[PDB]
Structure 1
Amino acid sequence: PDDRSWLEHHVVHQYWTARPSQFPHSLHLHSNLAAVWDQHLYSSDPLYVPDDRVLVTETQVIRETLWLLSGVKKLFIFQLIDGKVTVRNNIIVTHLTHSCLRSVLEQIAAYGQVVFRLQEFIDEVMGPFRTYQAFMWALYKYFISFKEELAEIEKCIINTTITLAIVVDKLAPRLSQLKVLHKVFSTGVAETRNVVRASHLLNTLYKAILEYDEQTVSLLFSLWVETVRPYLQTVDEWIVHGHLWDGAREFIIQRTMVSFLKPVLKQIIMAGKSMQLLKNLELDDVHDPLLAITFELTLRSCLYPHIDKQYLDCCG
């Protein structure tokens, strides 16, 4: 009635509303495939198997997939049960014979698992480790730009034809990059002490990029730097301020070792103690300008002049 009637017109209310979602599609088995399905079922004698189904429209599936890629929960499609997103069973379009929709939504649900577990990981940091808490910042910083691309796609939904088969091929170079994160994070979640849980995590990244030696290597490198930031900060602080300022014994010398800084570690310790014996009597902001002026093996071999000349000054 008068206002709620304006609602019933100017609202898309069909599957999510508690009502059998009736649909005025066009006809003509490009979109009459559900009826064409059912009658040949009944000639082949199922016998009848006429289960209740919600009969969703087409574009709303794309909107739900965009929300699943966002990482939000409590959606009418992909109802998770035990931390595992799972497609519903009454979902059918006028075409795609009720079974193929289950297959394509199963693949997108396999991607929804990868995004949902990372969102749960970030929730368990937000609600002084200095390394995980610095790692989720790089992960989050990836997530915002990814969300920008999908939220842009939602704009051209509301204002050109758009389907499933176009949006999946449009999101190909993003669904490629997310699969790398499903394997990189899997080693950072599978583990109890605070030093091994950070050392193993930081060492896995340095191994996994040397596996990949382009757009994946840029993602892995930009994820590497914002996670190796705390160690570089504490090493520079121990060098120039003459004391090791650690929180929760995060650093490996508890006053079992990352091989990232192993070719120079003797020249670090041999400075820290020699500098501490002197007082009784911006290093990340140098590594990042090095990238402005053969990746992570020879390129990492140019970071060590910055830690070695400062070393030579301290011991001399």
Structure 2
Amino acid sequence: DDRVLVTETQVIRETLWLLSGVKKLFIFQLIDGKVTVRNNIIVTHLTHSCLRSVLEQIAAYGQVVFRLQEFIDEVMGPFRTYQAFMWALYKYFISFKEELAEIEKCIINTTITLAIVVDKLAPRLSQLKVLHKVFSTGVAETRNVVRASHLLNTLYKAILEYDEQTVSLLFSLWVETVRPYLQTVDEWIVHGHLWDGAREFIIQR
């Protein structure tokens, strides 16, 4: 059986791209919306199997970030809530991307190997696992008023479960998703009329 025998540093660069959410990578070739490690990858060490083990874990993280990127894509290419929800998600990704991008700087310009970049990314791979469970309830579902109510209610329930850095994320993710309702509620009060779109509000007049 033949193998490609990739070098060592090349893997970390590829892993960073998987974290970034980019597709079409020589490693982690997805097939059906499910990232999956290749079969001919081997390093001088690590006996060709531990590599399939360590990559398999990071792959599980790629799924969490690839699916979210697929979600943001299906909104860019007037719900006023999902569109207001992704802007919170999108805002989190830019800052998260900066930490991953910064690491790439210290690679081209100190020794760096696998077991170091992972432990350096512990407080991120932790925060990311939460989103795989918070968003799972925002994707498993047809009317526009039940898809937005059941989503916004899942956050306020999931925060009371976590009552620190994980709470600061969900809270900063909450405010930027309840911004639509707080607007129309105020707009209904002072301007004396309910100005809704697609009957998004729960009061279907």
TM-score, normalized by length of structure 2? Answer: 1.00
Over the matched positions of the two proteins, sequence identity in percent amounts to 100
Aligned to 2:48: 98
Task: From the CA coordinates, give the structure whose radius of gyration is larger.
Answer: 1
Once the two structures are superposed, what CA deviation does each residue of 1:121-152 show, in whole Å capped at 9, x if it has no partner?
A: 00000000000000000000000000000000
Once the two structures are superposed, what CA deviation does each residue of 1:100-134 show, in whole Å capped at 9, x if it has no partner?
A: 00000000000000000000000000000000000
Shift of 1:225: 0.1
Counterpart-to-counterpart distance in 2, 1:209 and 1:242 = 33
1:197 matched to 2:172? The reply is: no
The DSSP-based 3-state class of the residue aligned with 2:119 is helix
Once the two structures are superposed, what CA deviation does each residue of 1:63-112 show, in whole Å capped at 9, x if it has no partner?
A: 00000000000000000000000000000000000000000000000000
Q: Which runs of 5+ in 1 are unaligned?
A: 1-50, 256-316
Counterpart-to-counterpart distance in 2, 1:164 and 1:117 = 24
Counterpart-to-counterpart distance in 2, 1:130 and 1:207 = 22
Counterpart-to-counterpart distance in 1, 2:52 and 2:116 = 18
Counterpart-to-counterpart distance in 2, 1:241 and 1:75 = 53
Shift of 1:156: 0.2
Q: Which runs of 4+ in 1 moved over 6 A?
A: none
Counterpart-to-counterpart distance in 2, 1:220 and 1:140 = 14
Shift of 1:199: 0.1
Shift of 1:193: 0.1
The DSSP-based 3-state class of the residue aligned with 1:148 is helix
Shift of 1:232: 0.1
Shift of 1:164: 0.5
Shift of 1:194: 0.0
Aligned to 2:136: 186
Counterpart-to-counterpart distance in 1, 2:92 and 2:103 = 18
Aligned to 1:128: 78
Shift of 1:243: 0.1
Hey, which of these two has a bigger chunk of helix by percent?
Answer: 2
Once the two structures are superposed, what CA deviation does each residue of 1:188-220 show, in whole Å capped at 9, x if it has no partner?
A: 000000000000000000000000000000000
Shift of 1:224: 0.1
Bigger relative contact order (CA 8 A; separation at least 6): 2
Task: Indicate the RMSD between aligned Cα atoms, in angstroms.
Answer: 0.2
Aligned to 1:36: none
Shift of 1:221: 0.1
Aligned to 2:2: 52
Counterpart-to-counterpart distance in 1, 2:66 and 2:191 = 42
